[PDB]
A paper describes a structure:
Amyloid fibers of the protein α‐synuclein (αSyn) constitute the major content of pathological intraneuronal inclusions, Lewy bodies, found in dopaminergic neurons in PD patient brains. Amyloids are polymers of monomeric protein units non‐covalently assembled through β‐strands arranged perpendicularly to the fibril long axis, forming a cross‐β structure. We report that αSyn amyloids display catalytic activity toward ATP hydrolysis in vitro. First, WT αSyn type 1A amyloids bind and hydrolyze ATP in a specific lysine‐rich cavity positioned between the two protofilaments.
To assure that the overall fold of the lysine‐mutated αSyn amyloids had not changed, we solved the cryo‐EM structure of the K21A αSyn amyloid in the presence of ATP to 3.13 Å resolution. The structure reveals a type‐1A fold but without the extra N‐terminal β‐strand comprising residues 16‐22. Still, we detected density for ATP, in the same cavity as found with the WT αSyn amyloids, implying that ATP binds but is not hydrolyzed. In accord, the ATP molecule is found in a different orientation in the K21A amyloid as compared to in the WT αSyn amyloid (compare Figures 2C and 5C). In the K21A amyloid, the phosphates of ATP point inward toward His50, whereas in the WT αSyn structure, the ATP phosphate tail points outward toward the new β‐strand of N‐terminal residues. Interestingly, in the ATP‐K21A structure, there is a small rearrangement (with respect to the ‘normal’ type 1A‐fold) of the N‐terminal stretch (residues 42‐38) in the direction away from the cavity/ATP site. This is the opposite direction to the ‘fold‐over’/enclosing rearrangement of the N‐terminus observed in the WT αSyn‐ATP complex. The fact that ATP binds to the K21A amyloids, despite a lack of chemical reactivity, was independently confirmed in solution using the fluorescent analog MANT‐ATP, which has an environment‐sensitive fluorophore attached to the ribose moiety. Whereas we detect over 400 µm free phosphate after 3 h of incubation with WT αSyn amyloids, the mutant amyloids showed little to no phosphate generation during this time interval. The binding mode observed from the docking of Mg2+‐ATP into the closed cavity of the WT structure and the open cavity of the K21A αSyn mutant agreed with the distinct ATP orientations observed in each cryo‐EM structure.
Author numbering:
A (entry chain O), B (entry chain M), C (entry chain K), D (entry chain I), E (entry chain G), F (entry chain P), ...: 36 to 96
The structure:
């Protein structure tokens, strides 16, 4: 159990991001597996479970 | 159990990011496995579970 | 059990990052395994679980 | 159990980072195993669990 | 059990880092094993668990 | 007299600007004179004349 | 007299700017004179004349 | 007289700027005169004339 | 008279600045005269004329 | 007269500056005269004229 009384709470917050990306050439070549690129300004909360951001895994057997 | 009374709390917070990325050429070449690139300005909270950011794993058997 | 009374708390916080990255050429070449690059300005909290940032593992058997 | 009364607490905090990285050429060549590069401005708190930042392991059997 | 009364506490904190890295050429060549490079401006707290920053291990059997 | 042959020229150019401004309160109080605020991402060329950006002058007699 | 043959020229150029400004309160109070604030990412070229950016002058008689 | 043959020229250029400014309170109080604040990422070229950036002058008689 | 043949030239260039400024309170109080503050990442070229950056003068008679 | 043949030249150049300024309180109090503060990462070239950066003068009669 969780109780908040009179309380101010911030969980998983992103307040203010300036990003510039200049690229003259970008290439992704993939065979199998996984690639994850460019995950930007991401916020999450999870309760009572696993939680993943920009996670990459090979094949599973 | 958790109790907050009259309390101000910040958990997993990112307040203010300026980013510049200049690249004349970017290449990812992948065979199998995993690649994770460029995860930027990420905030997370997890309760009662595992939590991963930019995790990369090889294959699993 | 956890109790906060009248208390101000910061856990896992990033307040203010200026980053510049200039590259004339970047290459990642991967065969199997894992590669993790560029994880920037990440904040996390985990309660009652494992927590990983930019973790990379080889294959698992 | 944990109790904070009237108390101000900072845990896992990064307040203010200026970074410049200039590279005329960067290459990662990987065969198996793991590579982790560039982990910058990261903050974490973990309660009652293991916690890793930029950890890298070879294969596991 | 832990109690803070009227107390100000800093644990795992980094307030203010200026970094410049100039490289005309960087290469990582890896076969098996693990490589960890450039872990910068990292702050962590762990309670009741092991905690590793920029840890690298060879394969495990 | 000016001549360009086969030539590529950039004069007064702004390619890429990301800006965030957060203010909880802004006030300008002015009595006479001049105030100039917030001039952002401005580009100009002038030929054979004077040119001013965000210039402010008091009264003239 | 000016001549460009086969030539690539950049004059007065700004390619890439990320800016964040956080203010909890801003006030300008002015009586007479001049105030100039926040001139950002400005590019200019002038030929055969005077040129000013963010210039401020008191009164003129 | 100016001549460029086969030539690459950069004059007055700003390629890459990441800026963060956090202020809990800013005040400018001015009586007469001049104030100039915050001029950022400015590029100028002037030919055959005077050129001023962030110049401030008291009154002129 | 100026001549460039086959030549690469950089004059007045700024390539790559990360800046953080944190202030809990800033005040400028001015009576007459001039104040100049915070001039950052400025580049200029002037030909055949005077050139000033962040210059401040008192009154002139 | 100036001549460049086959030549690479850098004049007035700044490639790569990381700056952090933390202040709990800043005040400028001015009566007459001049104040110049914080001039950072400035590059200039002047041909055939006087050139000043962050110059401050009292009143002139």
């Amino acid at each position: 159990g969780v109780l908040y009384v009179g309380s101010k709470t911030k969980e998983g917050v992103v307040h203010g991001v300036a990003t510039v990306a200049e690229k003259t050439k970008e290439q992704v070549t993939n065979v199998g597996g996984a690639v994850v690129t460019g995950v930007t300004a991401v916020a999450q909360k999870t309760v009572e479970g696993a939680g993943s951001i920009a996670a990459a895994t090979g094949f599973v057997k």
